[PDB]
Amino acid sequence: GSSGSSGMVKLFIGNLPREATEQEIRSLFEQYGKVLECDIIKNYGFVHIEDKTAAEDAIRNLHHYKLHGVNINVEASKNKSKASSGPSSG
């Protein structure tokens, strides 16, 4: 992304079934933002979205998304960060 700075945002997905495919997962995210990378290992899957704001949208819904009779779990791997020291004026 341009407006932002951090860039892509990794996503953690656990409780994945056997029918689940790198694609099925990727697409699910492509609905709330284009995907960059997608892997599935150790009953877990990692999804990287374009912008951050897009990640939240996806995660939210995707969360508890009845997939193949299963309730996959979604969590924002890279949590947000707030600057404490200094008023961050500029």
Structural domains of the chain in order of their starting residue, each with its CATH number: 8-80 (3.30.70.330)
Chain centroid to Cα 63, Å, comes to 10
> What's the rounded Cα separation, in Å, for the pair 54 and 2?
14
By three-state DSSP, how is residue 48 classified? strand
The coordinates were experimentally obtained by: NMR
**DSSP class of residue 43?**
T
The two three-digit tokens of residue 22, written as one number: 């790198």
